[PDB]
Structures are given as C-alpha cells and as structure tokens.
Amino acid sequence: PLGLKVTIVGLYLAVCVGGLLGNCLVMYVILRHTKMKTATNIYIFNLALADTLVLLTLPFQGTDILLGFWPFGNALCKTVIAIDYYNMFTSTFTLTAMSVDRYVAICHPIVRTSSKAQAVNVAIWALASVVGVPVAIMGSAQVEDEEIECLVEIPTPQDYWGPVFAICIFLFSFIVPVLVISVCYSLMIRRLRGVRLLSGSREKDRNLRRITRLVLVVVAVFVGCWTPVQVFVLAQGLGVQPSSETAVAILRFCTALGYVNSCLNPILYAFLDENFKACFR
Ligand SMILES: O=C(NCCCN1CCC(c2c(Cl)cccc2Cl)CC1)[C@H]1CCCN1Cc1ccccc1
C-alpha cells in the first residue's frame, strides 16, 4: 500500500546514501590512499564498483515503486536492467575468484599479484557482458496494459523460454559459482587439518587466517541476502505469479534485502579487516 511502499522507498534512500558513502570510501582507500593493492583488495574494489552502480539505480527504482509506472523512458529502462544483471553476475564471479585466490594461498604458501587480479576482474566483466548486453537489448519500457513499465521481454512461446532462461540464469548466476566456492573451502579444510603454525612464518599465518575469514563472511552475507530473490525469480519464470497484497509485499522486501547487501559490504570490511579498520577512523 501507500505507507508500506513509503517504507520501501525510504529504505532505498538509506541504503543509497550509506552504500555510496561506504563503497566510495573503500574504492578511494584502495585506489590512491595507500599501496594496499593486494589481490583480495583488487577483487574487493571490483565488488565496490558494482555496488556503486546498482546503488545509483536505487532512486529511480524508488520513484517507480511510488508512482506505479516507469516515467524515465526506454534509455534509462535498459540502463537500469543492464546494471542489475551486471551486479548479480560480477558479484558472484568476483566472490568465486576471491575464494580460489584464498585456496591457492593455502595450497602454495611459499605468486599472487594485483596485476593478475586486475586481469581477472576484466574477464569477470566480459562474462557478465554475455548476459548484461543481451538483456539490455531485450529489456524495454512498454505499455502492455493500463500503464507503461520497464520489463525484460521473454520470447514466444513464453511457456517454453521462460523456464529456459529461469533455470539457466539460476544455475549460472548463482548455483555454480557458490558450488565452486564450496569446493574451495572444503578442500582447504582437508589440507588444513592437522596443521598448526604450518606452511608459513608465524606472523603471516595469522594474517592469512584473517583474510580467509573475511572472504568467507562476505560470501555468507551475499548468499543470505540474495537467495530469497533467486528462488522467487526462478518461480516467477516457471509461471508462479504473486496475486495478493502479502505476496507482493514479501517480494518487495526481499528485493530490498538484496540491495541492502550493496551497502552492507563496507561495514564488513571495517569490522573484519585491520587495514580498513585503521583507515576509517
Ligand atoms: O523490478 C524492478 N527491479 C527489480 C530488479 C530485481 N532483480 C531482478 C533480477 C534478479 C536476478 C539477476 Cl539480475 C540475475 C540472476 C538472478 C536474479 Cl534473481 C535480481 C533482482 C523494476 C523497477 C524499475 C524497473 N525495473 C527494474 C528491473 C531490473 C532488473 C530486471 C528487470 C527490471
């Protein structure tokens, strides 16, 4: 209703201001402030960049929720949709890259450099483009019934392609990346078992454990924020459509929840990363 969507939009504004502030801070700290351009932090920079873009979309989506239609036209319609998908894919792919980096650090403790991680970020945005660009072409703001709206157009017959795109996007933007991550940390367990102050100098081992913890928590927070949406959107692809005030409300709030993940990221760095913790204040 009117007041409940006022809640949604106010939530967006909060996530928008705090998220842009935090992620811009992080990007600044890594970029110029210090030669702390480590592999993990270059990947973190990638995350903050994607968060920045989607955060920039939050005000526009907010007005759409209020008015009940899209009053910004096709250009910004395709721009927004593109950013959204780019966000999901670059996020999961970057998290996977961080997890593989951690695993290599444990297996080969005795050659990871910012230049290679920068290259990985490039490849991440290229694959993301494989889905980001087509959706931008497909997405449009059209007046199907009663009102104009921004939507991604599913080809005819929708009953076939809907499930196709639903299952494929579900697997490849979510299940498979998370799956790889699971393999990485499980293998790290097998290797780590029975090792105390092993495969390193004392001081370094402690730092490695701290970074591994950080990556793990970031993954956990992300998966926790986007799993409800992922399941619901999958169900929507299969034809399962919400048709009650409560159903719509639940959906709106779970979508919001994922956007909250965008702003959550700098706080996690501030509490679980010593360098960042020093840099805030
Ligand atoms: O409903 C909107 N935005 C909600 C976007 C939700 N987004 C939809 C795609 C979701 C996604 C993605 Cl991009 C990738 C993999 C899995 C999943 Cl579930 C992630 C959540 C309305 C508000 C203004 C125009 N329109 C934006 C829109 C953004 C992306 C796709 C379709 C519409």
Swiss-Prot record:
Record's subcellular location: Cell membrane; Cytoplasmic vesicle
Taxonomy, superkingdom: Eukaryota
Site (Important for G protein-mediated signaling): 64, 84
Ranges in the topological domain labelled Extracellular: 64-78, 139-161, 236-250
GO molecular function, one term: neuropeptide binding
Effect of residue 61 to A: Impairs G protein-mediated inhibition of adenylate cyclase
Transmembrane spans: 3-28, 42-63, 79-100, 116-138, 162-186, 215-235, 251-272
Gene Ontology BP annotations: adenylate cyclase-inhibiting G protein-coupled receptor signaling pathway; calcium-mediated signaling; neuron-neuron synaptic transmission; neuropeptide signaling pathway; phospholipase C-activating G protein-coupled receptor signaling pathway; sensory perception; sensory perception of pain
Disulphide connectivity of cysteines: 77-150
Tissues expressing this chain: Detected in blood leukocytes.
A GO cellular component entry from the record: synaptic membrane
Inducing stimuli: By phytohemagglutinin (PHA).
Listed result of changing residue 230 to A: Impairs G protein-mediated inhibition of adenylate cyclase
Keywords: Behavior, Cell membrane, Cytoplasmic vesicle, Disulfide bond, G-protein coupled receptor, Glycoprotein, Lipoprotein, Membrane, Palmitate, Phosphoprotein, Receptor, Transducer, Transmembrane, Transmembrane helix
UniProt topological domain (Cytoplasmic) ranges: 29-41, 101-115, 187-214
Family the UniProt entry places it in: Belongs to the G-protein coupled receptor 1 family.
Protein task: G-protein coupled opioid receptor that functions as a receptor for the endogenous neuropeptide nociceptin. Ligand binding causes a conformation change that triggers signaling via guanine nucleotide-binding proteins (G proteins) and modulates the activity of down-stream effectors. Signaling via G proteins mediates inhibition of adenylate cyclase activity and calcium channel activity. Arrestins modulate signaling via G proteins and mediate the activation of alternative signaling pathways that lead to the activation of MAP kinases.
Protein name: Nociceptin receptor
Species: Homo sapiens (Human)
Name of encoding gene: OPRL1
Residues included from the entire protein: 47 to 331 of 370
